[PDB]
Every structure is written in C-alpha cells, then in structure tokens.
C-alpha cells in the first residue's frame, strides 16, 4: 500500500467537518435505499484509492485489494 | 440523559462548549460560580459553617460516604 496521500489526515480545522463526513452525511440524508447506496458506495471508494495509491498490487486495484487486510 | 464521555472522544463542538462554559464559569460572580464551587472541596473551608472560627475542609475522605460526596 502506497498511501501516497497521507493527506487523508489533513482534515478540516474545525475538525468535525471532514470530506468523508460531508460525503457520508449527505448519503444518510436520502430515504431511498438506492439513492443512498450511490452516495454511500462512492464514499466507500475513497479509502481504496487513498491507501492503494500508485502501487500495482494494493487496495487501489479491484483485483488485488481483497488481498490486503485493510 | 446527559452523557459523560471520554475526554478524547469529545467533539470539537463538544470541547468548544466545555471550554467556553468553564471560562464563563470562572467569571461567574455567583456563589454557583467556579471559585465558589472550588471552595467546597477544600480551602477556604466551608464545612462547619461558612463563617465559623475553626473551619475544616470538606472532605468526607477516608469514609464510606466518600464516593457519594464526590
Ligand atoms: O478529591 Cu476529595 O477526592 Cu478526589
């Protein structure tokens, strides 16, 4: 895992508001399950990319990601 | 159900309130005020009476009652 972007820890100064939180909260807002899932799933994707980074065998790749314990 | 949580867990907003509240409490002129509240535990000693020649500190320390008092 090449968490090239350590930047993840760069949250907001207020600290509550975070990108994840903003994204997640919005997802929570929807009543419809389907609508909820689209937002929900995308938020999910971010972690995969952030950890995997550039590395060929990692979280970032669909193929490889299951291998990592994260 | 006011909730007491680990200090670490606390939110910035949660923290925000405590910091402001205590600071305001510090200012509080009232008997309810912080300086006054502090006197409950120890000096100035209030126990025998608020105005009594010999005063003892309010510690039901070394007693069964101790956890209740605190
Ligand atoms: O102070 Cu009297 O007990 Cu912790």
Cβ within 8 Å, pair B11-A14: no
Structure obtained using: cryo-EM
CA dihedral (B51, B54, B55, B61) positive or negative: negative
Q: Kindly state the tokens that stand for B62.
A: 């070394």
Q: Judge if the beta carbon of residue B61 lies within 6 A of ligand 1.
A: yes
A-B CB pairs within 8 A amount to 6
CA-B69 nearest atom, ligand 1: 2
Who's near A61: CB < 8 A, 6+ residues apart? A52
DSSP state of B1: -
Give Cα separations from A61 to A2, A44, A50 (angstroms): 12, 14, 11
* A52, A60 contact by CB (below 8 A): yes
C-beta neighbour count of B70 within 10 angstroms: 9
Q: What is the DSSP string of A22-52?
A: HHHHHHHH--SHHHHHHHHHHHHHHHHHHHH
Atom in ligand 1 nearest the alpha carbon of residue B41:
2
């Amino acid at each position: 895992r090449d968490i090239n972007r350590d930047r993840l820890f760069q949250g907001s100064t207020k600290t509550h508001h975070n990108w994840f939180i903003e994204q997640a909260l919005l997802a929570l807002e929807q009543t419809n399950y389907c609508d909820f899932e689209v937002q929900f799933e995308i938020m999910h994707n971010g972690v995969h990319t952030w950890v995997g980074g550039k590395e060929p065998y990692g979280i970032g790749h669909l193929h490889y990601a299951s291998y990592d314990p994260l | 159900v006011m909730i007491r949580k680990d200090i670490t867990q606390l939110d910035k907003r949660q923290q925000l309130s405590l910091v402001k509240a205590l600071e305001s409490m510090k200012a509080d002129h009232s008997s309810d005020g912080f300086q006054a509240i502090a006197s409950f535990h120890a000096l100035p000693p209030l126990c025998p009476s608020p105005a009594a020649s010999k005063r003892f500190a309010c510690c039901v320390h070394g007693m069964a009652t101790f956890p209740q008092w605190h």
